[PDB]
Amino acid sequence: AKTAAALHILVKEEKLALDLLEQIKNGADFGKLAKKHSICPSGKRGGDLGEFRQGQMVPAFDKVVFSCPVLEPTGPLHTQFGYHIIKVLYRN
């Protein structure tokens, strides 16, 4: 689509992603979990990038945006920086 609204959490290693995967079902909070675990310069912003086009952050985003349609969180997916879990919205 032209642009998509996406929430993103970047996990350094799968073991933390495994803790993240279980935590959301047991707890359930994608926005707050990004705040708690991102601890990065893009925690406040990466945890809520708003709408952006495929040419901003990372190609793997094209793979998932072309993997699951918007309104359907997907991840954690494989990426060179670690594992990306992304929630897809708007997308237009």
Amino acid found at 8 = H
Note down the domain range covering 72: 1-92
- The residues near 70 (Cβ < 8 Å, ≥ 6 apart) are 1, 4, 88, 89, 90, 91
Q: DSSP code of 48?
A: G
CB–CB of 3/53 below 8 Å? yes
**Proportion of the chain in helix, strand, coil states, percent, rounded to 5:** 35, 25, 40
- CB-side exposure of 92: number of CA atoms within 13 Å? 3
**Distance spanning both ends of the chain, measured CA to CA:** 5
The rounded distance, in Å, linking the Cα atoms of 88 and 5 is 6
| Experimentally determined by | NMR
- What residues form DSSP beta bridges with 44? none
Q: Which residue has the tokens 């279980």?
A: 22
- What residues form DSSP beta bridges with 74? 86
The number of folded domains in the chain is: 1
CATH number of the domain where residue 56 is located = 3.10.50.40
